[PDB]
C-alpha cells in the first residue's frame, strides 16, 4: 500500500483535490484506489486510483 490512513495527499494533475486518506478500494480497473476527505470541505470524500495521487 502506497498510502495509509491519515496521509495527506493531493491530486497530481487535472481536477484538484487535497486532504487525508480515509479509505481504500480495489476493482479490476483500479486495483489500488484511495478515498480522500477534503481538507477544505470537511465530510466530502472523493475516490481516486493511486497513480492520480501524491503524498505531501
Amino acid at each position: 500500500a502506497t498510502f495509509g490512513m491519515g496521509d495527506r495527499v493531493r491530486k497530481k494533475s487535472g481536477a484538484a483535490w487535497q486532504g487525508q486518506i480515509v479509505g481504500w478500494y480495489c476493482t479490476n480497473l483500479t486495483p489500488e484506489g484511495y478515498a480522500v476527505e477534503s481538507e477544505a470541505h470537511p465530510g466530502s470524500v472523493q475516490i481516486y486510483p493511486v497513480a492520480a495521487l501524491e503524498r505531501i
Copy 2:
C-alpha cells in the same frame, strides 16, 4: 431557477462544498439540481439538489 451561473453557493449541512454554480441537471428525484465547482479545488465539480444549497 433559484441560482444562476456563477453564483457562489455552499452546502447547507452535512458534507461541505463551496464554490460557483457551473451547471444544472434535472431528474425525477432531483427536478432542480446544480453542478458546483469547488473554489478550493479547481476543476472538481459536485452536483446537488437545490434544497441542499444556499447562495452566499
Copy 3:
C-alpha cells in the same frame, strides 16, 4: 452542443456508464460537460466531459 436533453449516451472507455443526458456543466477544465442519469440505477447521476461520451 454535441448532445441534448434526453439523448441516450454511454462512456466510451474505462469506467462504464449509460443512460440519458439530464444536464450540462462547463468549467475551464471541462468546457463542455454532461450529467447522465443511469438507466440501470435510476436517480444516480454522474458527470463527464463530452469527449468521454458517445450517443447510442
Copy 4:
C-alpha cells in the same frame, strides 16, 4: 463491519445503486462507509454510509 468485500448490496432508498462491496472509508460524518462497484456499470464506483445500504 456490517459488510465485507464482495458482498452484494443495494441502496435502500433515493438514488439507486447495486453491486459489490469493493472498499471501505471512515470519516467523522460517515464513520462506517462503503465503496460499491456497480454490477450494471463495471468500473464505476460510488461510496455510501452503511445506513444507506442493504445486503441482498
